[PDB]
Amino acid sequence: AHVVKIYDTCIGCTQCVRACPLDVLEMVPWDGCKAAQMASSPRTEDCVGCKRCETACPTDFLSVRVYLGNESTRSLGLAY
Amino acid sequence: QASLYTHHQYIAGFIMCGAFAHGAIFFIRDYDPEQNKGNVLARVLDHKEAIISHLSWVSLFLGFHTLGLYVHN
Amino acid sequence: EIGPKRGSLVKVLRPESYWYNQVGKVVSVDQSGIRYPVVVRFENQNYAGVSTNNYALDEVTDPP
Amino acid sequence: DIAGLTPCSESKAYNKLERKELKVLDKRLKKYEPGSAPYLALQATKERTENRFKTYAKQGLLCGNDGLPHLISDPGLALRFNHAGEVFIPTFGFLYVAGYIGHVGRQYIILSKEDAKPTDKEIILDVPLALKLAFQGWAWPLASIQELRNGSLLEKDENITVSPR
Amino acid sequence: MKDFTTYLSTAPVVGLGWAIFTSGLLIEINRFFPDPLVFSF
Amino acid sequence: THIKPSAQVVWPIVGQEILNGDVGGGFQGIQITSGFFQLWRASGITSELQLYSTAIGGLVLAAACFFAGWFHYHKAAPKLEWFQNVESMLNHHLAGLLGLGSLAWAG
Amino acid sequence: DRPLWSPGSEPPAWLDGSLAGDYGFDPLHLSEEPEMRKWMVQAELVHARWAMLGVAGILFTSIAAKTGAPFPDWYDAGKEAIKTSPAPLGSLIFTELLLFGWVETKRLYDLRNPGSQGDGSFLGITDGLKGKENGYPGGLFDPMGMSKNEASYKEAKVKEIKNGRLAMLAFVGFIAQHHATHKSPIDNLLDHVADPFHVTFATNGVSIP
Amino acid sequence: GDFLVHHAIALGLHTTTLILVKGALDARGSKLMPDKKDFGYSFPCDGPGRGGTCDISAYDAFYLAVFWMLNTI
Amino acid sequence: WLRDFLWAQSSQVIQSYGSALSAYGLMFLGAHFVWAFSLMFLFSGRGYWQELIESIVWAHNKLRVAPSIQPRALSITQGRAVGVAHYLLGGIATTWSFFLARIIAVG
Amino acid sequence: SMQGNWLPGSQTPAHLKDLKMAGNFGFDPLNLGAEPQALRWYQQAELVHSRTAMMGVAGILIPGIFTKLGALNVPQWYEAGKVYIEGEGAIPFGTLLMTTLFSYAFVEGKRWQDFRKPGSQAEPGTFFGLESQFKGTENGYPGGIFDPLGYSKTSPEKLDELKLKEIKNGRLAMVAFLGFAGQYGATGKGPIDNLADHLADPWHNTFAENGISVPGLSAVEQAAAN
Ligand code: CLA
Ligand code: CLA
Ligand code: CLA
Ligand code: CLA
Ligand SMILES: CC(/C=C/C=C(C)/C=C/[C@@]12O[C@]1(C)C[C@@H](O)CC2(C)C)=C\C=C\C=C(C)\C=C\C=C(C)\C=C\[C@@]12O[C@]1(C)C[C@@H](O)CC2(C)C
Ligand SMILES: CC1=C(/C=C/C(C)=C/C=C/C(C)=C/C=C/C=C(C)/C=C/C=C(C)/C=C/C2=C(C)CCCC2(C)C)C(C)(C)CCC1
Ligand SMILES: CC1=C(C/C=C(\C)CCC[C@H](C)CCC[C@H](C)CCCC(C)C)C(=O)c2ccccc2C1=O
Ligand code: SF4
Ligand code: SF4
């Protein structure tokens, strides 16, 4: 499916996982930020590429990046 | 003669559009800034905003006054 | 202690940031040793609408 | 007599266009009594047309093969021949006002950016200061030249947002 | 008057006052003087 | 049947004197298209004095409507239950507005 | 506390009664800012003084014409005056414009900066050409000088502003009933006192259809 | 009239050059999107975030420039 | 339909110059302009225009005429609204000018 | 220092309050002299414009006065150029213009290099040995052979009084030459004839009665006469 990557600029506001209506992102413990949290994407193959996490990302530039390509039956949002 | 001129002019326009598109493809795909540092290409990319802004200025000025005189007449 | 003074104007040299070659005001510098401890506030919003961003020590300098 | 263009005073097509306009204007005169307001308006229109055709002639104006006056754009050719009044002086006439507008806008921009929360001054204008700059912009080229010379006109790229290519 | 003149210094001072002034100005040059083409003073 | 209707007169400022077309009747102006002359012939209207009176009455009613909006918002604003009286609104805008206007126009 | 323009009304806060003729009549909230208050006071006084001057001149000319002197109507007086005037039109209005520009810029910069013209810059006049109050100058403008006493000065201020407002109303009446009757104001006054029960603003034909 | 339509031709050439040049120079980076080089030459958009990024690629710059080329020819 | 309605008619709109209906021809061509100008807002998006605005902001930054309010491109919904409004205005005024000039110069 | 005021009660600019200048009246509403080197260049420009205005206006007036007195047949200034062009023993217009431009370019380059670097024209052995006196005393006041009668090497009081007098007569001459150009443009006659018309008939001979100066005034007068 698509490729979702999270960079070290994330500060653990844990709102990118709320804006994603597909449970692609998850919050793991970290040590590189004050909140001690980092976005991770275990269920990346379930992503469609709606870029709602990029909308919800407050960092400049975006800590979570979604790259389109290699569409599938789950990445195309198909119920048929 | 009319058909020949129109054909080769439209062909030329499409080919120039393809030239600029493939130049853009060069810039994004296989352009290495550390390979040619400080050369004409990197310097052109450095002040790209000036080139784009001046092209926008001359296009806006030409269109403004050409449409103004056409509507005036 | 390890960063710029709080409330002092700094210049951001981060290329991918919206505020590249811009001036921002430091609001807090973290002392716990994180990746981007310097927190600055800008008077102009970005396209996302936010006004604050975090940068490393090497991405901030005193403007002339 | 440049670019193969005859003067407007000695042009047959110019007079043909003038008499055609007079004829079509006098066509509408026959449908109104001479002591009527539409008749007075048509007479004023005819007088304005005659005055325009008289003033366009003997004014250093040329026309060629169409009866419509032509404008000479190259300076120098507009200097040795009496054609500067077409575009030469009105170029500076427009440029003076354009620099006036740009200079008063720049003055307002600097004098607003040095004020707390300066984003409201663009939607909430101030009239005394804008009018003060409006009546101080007559010497815009001198101020622009001195600002370019002292370096306050331009700004160091170091302080300019630059695309990261 | 303070509250009213704060409103009157918003959009209509630049969108209406300038527009009406510059317009009616140009109307009166085009009215009192006829249509010119050559700047012969 | 021979004079074209006209109700807009342009100024002689710049070249607009050609827009004041010969609509007949010793008059020049824009040939209108809204059909207002037909409406003012249907309702009995003879002179321009009656049109002047209608214009002044319309201006007075417009000022009254603007004052009504100002009053009914800033001064005496109705509550939510006043707007929710749907049956009263329907009765008053069926018998009152439409019916009374139809009767007044019939008279 | 003072007689108001409407009995039982509430006077404006910015109209506390310190001004001459302060009846508290201000429904449009004008002259609320102190700078705009001073500008409105100056405008009222200058419009007042010009109104009393013009109305007095109109009344004098109309009375002289009624006696039998060859005086014109208050309307089109200048139209027949320029035919016998040594000064042609154009030169007269521009001479007036230059003189009034000098005087009115002087009084305007005295309004913005009080006492600014009393620096001796113009012909070395210090005490004269220096303002005494908001719109009330002194020195050369007060030759007899009965404004020294404060009570008399305040009474004269109230008298001046009241007669001036009456002069505004007089000029408006002059133009209105000249358009109504096409006659002199003294002619209208004599017609009103001759036949009060019939000759009025209603039986003049126009203005009452 | 020949000179006026020549200026219209110059306007069309200038505007097509402006858009193609801007698409070529901003093909790899922009202030709205610094990482355009990682998304390929022909990608749709980046989403509704950051105000809206429709037609942000250099491919869409070429696509809009073909209209101006057609108008110019 | 084309030849016998839009070409058999509209010969008076183009030949309205020098007459009372020349303003209808002016309205016709201005409506053509506004209808054609709308397709810029309709085919295009926001990212290209935002980047062009960024270049213009750099140009105004070079000589310090940067506005305090940051210039931004129109929103995608805003751009669609502008495009549809200019398209409708151009088409409506085109048909208005053509219909009125044809029906006045003939009927 | 601060001598007089162009407008009493006006807010004088901050760069004119304590500035030692000749003829300083606070007249800078546009604040073009806020920068010091800007003010120096404008002072030099005003000085050269004023001095050539003295020369020009004297050429307007003294031959005109002597023509009115009948001493010489020297014509008015607006046709004097055509008179000399159409003369017999006349240098051609191109030669005269090029000689004037060459000589003025030379002397103005001298003055320019004095302005940018003060006293730089006193470089030894550069102008036939006479350049030792080419050192500039002040901006626009060179001295040397430019004061051969020794009227400037005295106490500063009469010196800056004379500077004030020079700038006053120079501003007057500049407005006077603008007037000469305007009153040839409108009336079409010499300034002495215009002064004679204004003295003999002041009301009927003015800028307002002439329709070129204020267009539309003649129509107003004609409508008021009818
Ligand atoms: C025929 C229709 C039409 C017209 C007139 C324009 C006009 C313009 N487009 Mg284009 N465009 C069109 C169709 C059109 N477009 C289509 C179909 C597409 C494909 C999507 C594009 C794609 C496109 C791109 C991709 C770009 C342009 C750009 C431009 C500008 C070029 C600058 C110029 O020539 O000077 C100005 C030209 C004018 C015609 C001026 C129009 C304004 C006049 C003076 C009226 C102004 C208002 C008037 C005073 C009335 C006020 C009241 C009113 C507002 C209610 C100009 C605004 C470029 C741009 O904006 O960058 C500079 C650019 O990058 N356009
Ligand atoms: C000889 C010159 C030349 C060469 C070698 C190439 C080669 C290439 N270009 Mg380039 N290009 C050219 C001319 C050229 N192009 C011209 C003239 C244009 C302007 C129109 C472009 C515009 C262009 C763009 C914008 C892009 C390329 C891309 C590409 C690559 C793949 C394109 C491809 O084959 O897809 C095969 C495509 C098709 C089979 C689709 C055919 C449909 C055509 C184009 C539409 C014709 C309309 C209509 C249907 C025709 C029939 C009419 C009907 C009535 C019968 C390849 C590197 C792409 C690339 O590098 O990928 C990132 C890319 O993004 N080029
Ligand atoms: C007075 C302010 C001001 C100034 C000094 C400039 C200066 C500049 N602009 Mg900018 N511009 C402005 C306002 C201003 N602009 C506004 C308000 C807009 C939005 C419509 C733009 C849109 C714009 C574009 C899209 C482009 C420029 C470009 C340019 C450059 C070319 C010069 C020119 O005439 O462009 C033409 C400018 C216009 C067509 C804009 C006219 C709008 C009016 C005249 C401005 C009104 C401002 C107001 C009067 C100031 C308030 C006065 C104060 C007393 C209250 C130059 C750097 C071009 C560039 O990058 O070249 C390097 C370019 O492509 N400008
Ligand atoms: C018989 C009584 C009566 C009449 C005649 C009207 C008439 C009207 N009402 Mg209705 N209304 C009524 C009772 C009435 N109302 C009652 C009882 C309620 C509460 C349940 C409402 C609640 C109501 C709402 C919530 C709204 C209306 C609105 C309207 C207007 C609809 C616009 C229209 O059709 O254009 C016709 C336009 C005209 C005929 C122009 C002349 C308008 C005149 C001045 C109105 C005079 C009618 C009025 C009832 C007279 C008494 C008012 C008195 C206090 C002075 C119209 C004027 C709408 C509105 O705001 O417009 C005012 C609206 O949104 N009505
Ligand atoms: C009436 C008038 C002004 C009235 C204004 C009013 C009611 C305003 C009311 C309010 O503001 C208040 C108070 C408070 C606000 O909260 C509310 C409102 C409602 C806004 C001015 C007249 C002002 C009238 C004036 C100044 C008259 C001047 C006359 C002159 C100069 C005569 C000159 C002559 O030339 C003639 C005309 C003809 C020649 O024959 C003779 C000579 C002598 C030559
Ligand atoms: C001989 C002669 C002459 C001359 C001529 C000339 C000198 C010419 C020139 C010409 C020219 C000079 C031209 C040019 C053109 C150009 C073009 C057309 C371009 C294009 C471009 C492009 C398309 C680009 C691309 C790209 C990109 C985008 C990026 C990078 C890569 C590339 C580069 C690929 C004369 C006139 C004197 C006279 C007659 C004869
Ligand atoms: C052109 C364009 C823009 C750029 C347009 C912008 C930023 C709006 C510009 C509005 C102007 C500033 C309004 C005023 C116009 C003139 C200045 C008015 C002149 C009036 C005279 C009297 C001087 C978009 O932002 C956009 C967004 C989404 C889809 C398509 C498009 C699109 O096509
Ligand atoms: S939205 Fe972005 S910055 Fe915020 S927790 Fe997620 S990856 Fe980190
Ligand atoms: S693009 Fe959408 S589905 Fe995919 S990780 Fe982001 S918010 Fe979730």
Burial label for D165, CB within 10 Å (0-12, 13-18, 19+), is: buried
**C-alpha pair distances (Å), A74 with each of A50, A66, A69, B50:** 13, 15, 13, 45
What are the residues whose beta carbons fall under 8 Å from the beta carbon of G80, sequence distance 6 or more? G72
State how far the Cα of G153 lies from the Cα of G20, in Å rounded to an integer.
Answer: 10
Ligand 2 centroid–CA B22 distance in Å is 10
Tokens 């009152």 belong to residue: F96
Distance of CA A73 to the CA centre of its chain: 19
> What string of DSSP letters covers E1-41?
-HHHHHHTTSTHHHHTHHHHHHHHHHHHHHHHS----S---
- Provide CB contacts within 8 A for D124, sequence distance 6+: E6, E9, E10
Nearest to H55 by CA among H44, H66, H67, H47: H44
Top mutation candidate among B60, B66, B70 for ligand 1, by most atoms within 8 Å of CB:
B60
Determine which of F3, F8, F10, F19 to mutate to test the interface with I (most I C-beta atoms within 10 Å).
F19
Q: How far apart are CA D131 and CA F59, in angstroms?
A: 37
Q: How far apart are CA C62 and CA C50, in angstroms?
A: 23
What span, in angstroms and rounded, lies between the C-alpha atoms of D91 and F61?
53
Cβ(H62)–Cβ(H23) under 8 Å? yes
Domains and CATH numbers, chain E: 1-41 (1.20.5.510)
HEC readout, chain D: CCCCCEECCCCHHHHHHHHHHHHHHHHHHHHCCCCCHHHHHHHHHHHHHHHHHHHHCCCCCEECCCCCEECCCCCCHHHHCCCHHHHHHHHHHHHHHHHHHHHHHHHHHHHHHCCCCHHHCCCCCCHHHHHHHHCCCCCHHHHHHHHHHHCCCCCCHHHCCCCCC
Residues G136 and B72: their CA atoms lie apart, in Å, by: 56
State whether residue C60 is helix, strand or coil.
strand
Q: What is the DSSP string of chain B?
A: -HHHHHHHHHHHHHHHHHHHHHHHHHHHHS--TTTS-SSHHHHHHHTHHHHHHHHHHHHHHHHHHHHHHHHH-
Using an 8 Å Cβ cutoff, are D16 and D65 in contact?
no
Q: How far is it, in rounded angstroms, from Cα D102 to Cα J24?
A: 31
What Rg do the C-alpha atoms of chain F give, in angstroms? 21
| Alpha-carbon gap, residue F27 to F41, rounded angstroms | 19
Alpha carbon I3 to chain centroid distance? Answer: 25
Atom of ligand 9 minimally distant from the CA of A41: 5
CB neighbour class for D2 (10 Å; exposed up to 12, middle 13-18, buried from 19): middle
- SS3 state at F10: coil
Resolution in A: 2.9
Judge if the beta carbon of residue A1 lies within 6 A of ligand 9.
no
Task: Report the distance separating Cα J61 and Cα J172, nearest Å.
Answer: 13
Cα–Cα distance measured from residue I28 to residue I96, given in angstroms and rounded to the nearest whole number: 8
Residue J141 DSSP symbol? B
Note whether H1 contacts A: Cβ–Cβ < 8 A.
no
The answer to whether the CB of G107 falls within 8 A of the CB of G113 is no
Q: List the structure tokens of J187.
A: 């009336």
Chain I hits for F24, Cβ within 8 Å: none
Chains A and H touch (3+ CB pairs under 8 A): yes
Judging contacts by C-beta atoms under 8 Å, the chain D residues touching residue F22 are 28, 31, 38
Residue spans of alpha helices (H) in chain I: 11-14, 22-43, 47-62, 76-105
| Chain E residues with CB-CB distance to D61 below 8 A | 37-38
Task: Provide residues with CB under 6 Å of ligand 7.
Answer: I 40-41, 44-46, 49, 73-74, 76, 79
Phi, psi of G109 (to 5 degrees): -75, -20
Q: Which two tokens mark J130?
A: 């006479």
Distance CA J35, CA G111 (A): 32
DSSP conformation letters of F18-71 = GTSEE-SSS-EEEE--S-HHHHHHHTT--SHHHHHHHHHHHHHHHHHHHHHHHI
Q: Do D165 and B45 touch (CB under 8 A)?
A: yes
H helix or E strand, kind and range, residue J28: none
Chains B and J touch (3+ CB pairs under 8 A): no
Name the packing angle between helices J217-225 and G77-84 (round to 10°).
100
Q: What's the CA gap between F18 and I16, in Å, rounded? A: 11
Closest-CA residue of chain J to E32: J216
In contact, G167 and G55? CB cutoff 8 Å: yes
Q: How many CB atoms lie within 10 A of CB J38?
A: 19
Q: Quick one: how far is CA I69 from the chain centroid?
A: 27
Task: Tell me how far apart the alpha carbons of residues J127 and G190 are, in angstroms, rounded to a whole number.
Answer: 94
Specify the pairing of strand F28-31 against strand F21-22: antiparallel
Residue of E11, E13, E37 with shortest CB distance to D56: E37
Which chains would you list as touching D if contact means 3+ CB atom pairs under 8 Å?
A: B, C, E, F, H, I, J
CA-based max dimension of chain B: 55
Are the C-beta atoms of residues I48 and H61 closer than 8 Å to each other?
A: yes
* Contact indicator for A74, A45 with CB cutoff of 8 Å: yes
Ligand 9 centroid – CA A62 distance (Å): 13
Neighbours of chain G (3+ CB pairs under 8 A): E, J
CB D86 within 8 A of CB D78: yes
